[PDB]
UniProtKB/Swiss-Prot annotation, chains A, B:
UniProt keyword annotation of Zinc present: no
Any one GO CC term of the record: T=3 icosahedral viral capsid
Protein known as: Capsid protein precursor
InterPro entries: CP_picobirnavirus, CP_picobirnavirus_sf
High-level lineage: Viruses, Riboviria, Orthornavirae, Pisuviricota, Duplopiviricetes
Presence of keyword Cell inner membrane: no
Protein keywords: Acetylation, Capsid protein, T=3 icosahedral capsid protein, Virion
PTM description: The 7 kDa polypeptide is acetylated. Autocatalytic proteolysis releases a post-translationally modified peptide that remains associated with nucleic acid within the virion. This peptide is observed only when nucleic acid is packaged in the capsid.
Organism: Human picobirnavirus (strain Human/Thailand/Hy005102/-) (PBV)
Described purpose of this protein according to its UniProt entry: The capsid protein self-assembles to form an icosahedral capsid with a T=2 symmetry made of 120 subunits.
Length: 500, 500, 56
């Protein structure tokens, strides 16, 4: 060949600088020097996004009866605590189970602040997003972690010490699943300049035992991305979390009874951190499998949230013993977008989802673990009133965690190329504006930069027509709501299961 | 360990049919029962495209004086023919070189009709685009191949017999590249229900021999995908391809000189076909690398094409002994969209290209072979007149072939779900209309269904702003005009050569 | 019951694919008469099916 005869000309001809370090703006330049008269018609910008954050919410699953897996697990752990290990008989099954859920929220908070501490020591020349973009996506000021890192470390250690006052079973996979999910960095590819997936809890459950009418886990809001929160705000959040937890007699005898039934080696163990413990991003395909099938349900509903025609639709877990035979009722109203309007794009999520999977042959565990974060709407919630500004949807069942939002961190194409935060569901609405089509195209390109990005459903407001899954398909199926509800029931039963 | 002690429920809960055969419309249905009142706001339509045809054009490599690599190769092959072996003095070097260029067009046409005949025997139940969609994308009537298979077979055999009468050197790797490109299907993911890439000539060079002005090569059009031409149109094309070529007495004199110079074994031989010669799709990442880094230049300019301010910009490989010292002359003008107006989206190609490659370490052969189909504009061609409706762009030296446009085949949105043909460049213009945005969105989704799809530069007419490369970048670099011209000179010289 | 060839609104239906395959086997491999298309042969085969259903 000619290439074998003259390899020197081929070598000197094709020496190009590869491996551009992502994290800053790049300008391609002009091939035509007279193209400056067409200013916006030539796109010389080139931005590579680096961080996608999955804003998740811990849930016990769908529950409207006593036949829910949460109530079955409550009855089983109550039998193991009292009827086999001599309990105190000052509480029911549901009080113990809501106490266990409060433990889950505590361990999620500890893994969250441990990830916040461990992220800030990551520095590399090939990625300029490390570690400021991850701290921006977590809603924490990076200067407050640069300046007082030792205070952050000792606060994390003190959280791990104070969380050991109560007890929780180690063999329950719910705790270790939430702690592993909330404390990981997951690259979308096995390359040195990959993109970071993340899991930030926006919801934490706060114990609210007031009155005789039963306990309740009220919502507690976590810092959203772009809010520069310091260590004092996280300490205030932690003290608000254990305000009604420590100093409670019922919680004290519950911790004593769990410490009696399960041994000292049978309880969970929060690991101590120090100055040499840092985490690196790992490649997890099973994380990408459930990230791909993740379906957003929108921002949660609080007591302060105003809804026209929807009163009392807050995301609370109730423990009223006078109604429903004292069941742990938790079924929320989805589709709320954070404010009081119609949110036309959420109608695109009313079709049956497409379960996409890598490879050709799929095991049962792969299909079950790929549908952990999926949620399909089933029936519209009937409003109590003649006028209704939003539209809410009741699901047919969800897993141990739902997805509310997503967060994109990428460099801006305009001066001075700082980080931009883009919050979006799977559904993206593009209304009548000349500045919204190019922004939506840039958001689409930034989404498809990631490998297993969730399947979007873009609604165009000027054509009154939405679009299906905007993702590349390899081996897919159509999932009905009944089969996904069955898989969610299996997942919630297996996660809350404890061995006796 | 709930999955271990209850494996039957885990096995039964995840029995899903995953191998969905592409090639038909799929209605996912409504997950919410009352979502049928939202009309097009719930998109329950899912289509997977199957055919991407890359429409190319053979070129000598932008000759503009005697110092071009094609003229140097003409001098080298003329010294090899007439100085090393006792030849004739009736023909010059440029006549022999353009005879060799016309032999490439004849071999491309033979491989074209051979692929038309060999495609129609492809059938698999998991891909319903076989073989009707490939025959639609190749521009033939699919029913005419099935109804007249015996007349189609001997036509290809007679084309091979009447094109094998002349000689062309097999040591020259121009023919062994073009014939290998023009036949054979190329899957994009090496799976069973993969997507097929193709290569079809948009045009071919028909030999016409004039008097003292020269033996200039002329354009000859080819049927596009929405034509459904029968066998007699291809017979007419083959008849006027060699109408003034087989009727020339001096043609065989220089044809036999190649035979006696290069021997009887170092010649290009055409493979005869029978009823069992069936081609199969193969996986080649070398083809996908140059498919991914490909840039469209537009439709060729003909003598019948009307251009305001561009009277003599027709694509012709001229050779006049009177002017330019008897050199082969070929400098086409790109940027022609087929109509007599300026294509607004062609301004987006004035930025520097992005060479994206898989993996981390790239050899020099991979870099020089990944830039074969790319073509970058350098400077606008000066119009001859006070007004000009289109805008044409002169290249900085193109490679051995140029991509005109692309043809994409997919099933229809509505009844009866027949094949639809989409013709688009690398630049897609979305004008301000009611229904163009969702058509552009489904075009984008169908393009990103393909794995190594070319990078699209979408220009929006409402915002008067275009966007950069719409492709997933993995390991990329910015290519300037000078480096790509340096690569293209090497890639032109490496094909037009003889190692003796 | 009613004998049917299946759903067919395109040329990608299995009835048309079987018609093309049996037409190729009849003509292009076994020297057919070229006075009819694939579909005429396939409708003739369906008429044979109705005849054998009547006999049974």
């Amino acid at each position: 060949a000619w290439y074998a005869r003259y390899p020197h000309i081929l070598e000197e001809a094709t020496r190009l600088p590869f491996a551009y370090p992502i994290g800053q703006y790049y300008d391609t330049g002009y091939s035509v020097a007279s193209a400056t008269e067409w200013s916006k018609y030539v796109d010389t910008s080139l931005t590579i996004p680096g961080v996608m954050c999955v804003n998740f919410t811990p849930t016990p699953g769908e529950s409207y009866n006593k036949n829910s897996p949460i109530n079955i697990a409550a009855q089983n752990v109550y039998t193991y605590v009292r009827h086999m290990n001599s309990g105190h008989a000052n509480y029911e099954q549901a009080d113990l189970m809501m106490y266990l859920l409060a433990m889950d929220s505590l361990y999620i908070f500890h893994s969250y602040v441990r990830k916040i501490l461990a992220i800030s020591k990551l520095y590399t020349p090939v990625n300029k997003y490390f570690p400021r973009a991850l701290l921006v996506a977590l809603g924490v000021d990076p200067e407050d972690v640069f300046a007082n890192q030792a205070q952050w470390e000792y606060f994390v250690n003190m959280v791990a010490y104070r969380a050991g006052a109560f007890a929780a079973p180690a063999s329950m996979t719910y705790y270790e699943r939430h702690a592993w999910m909330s404390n990981g960095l997951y690259v979308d590819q096995d390359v040195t300049r990959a993109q970071i997936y993340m899991f930030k809890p926006t919801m934490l459950w706060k114990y609210e035992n007031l009155g005789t009418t039963g306990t309740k886990l009220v919502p507690l809001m976590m810092p959203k991305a772009g809010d520069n929160r310091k260590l004092v705000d996280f300490q205030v959040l932690f003290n608000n979390l254990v305000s009604t937890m420590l100093g409670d007699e019922d919680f004290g005898i519950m911790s004593g009874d769990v410490f009696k039934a399960f041994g000292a080696d049978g309880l969970v163990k929060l690991l101590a951190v120090d100055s040499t413990t840092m985490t690196l991003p790992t490649y997890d395909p099973l994380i990408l499998a459930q990230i791909h099938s993740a379906r957003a349900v929108g921002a949660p509903i609080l007591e302060t949230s105003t809804l026209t025609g929807f009163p009392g639709r807050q995301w609370q877990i109730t423990q009223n013993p006078d109604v429903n035979n004292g069941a742990i009722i938790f079924h929320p109203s989805f589709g709320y977008d954070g404010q009081d309007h119609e949110e036309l794009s959420f109608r695109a999520m009313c079709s049956n989802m497409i379960l996409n999977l890598p490879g050709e042959a799929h095991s049962a565990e792969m299909i079950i673990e790929a549908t952990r974060l999926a949620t399909m709407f089933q029936v519209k919630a009937v409003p109590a009133g003649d006028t209704s500004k939003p539209v809410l949807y009741l699901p047919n069942g969800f897993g141990t965690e739902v997805v509310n939002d997503y967060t994109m961190i990428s460099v801006d194409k305009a001066t001075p190329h700082d980080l931009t935060i883009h919050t979006f569901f799977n559904n993206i609405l593009v209304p009548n504006a000349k500045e919204n089509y190019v922004a939506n195209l840039e958001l689409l390109n930034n989404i498809i930069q990631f490998d297993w990005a969730p399947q979007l459903y873009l609604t165009y407001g000027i054509a009154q027509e939405s679009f299906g899954p905007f993702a590349q398909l390899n081996d897919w199926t159509i999932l009905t709501g009944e089969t996904l509800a069955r898989m969610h029931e299996v997942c919630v039963t297996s996660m809350f299961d404890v061995p006796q």
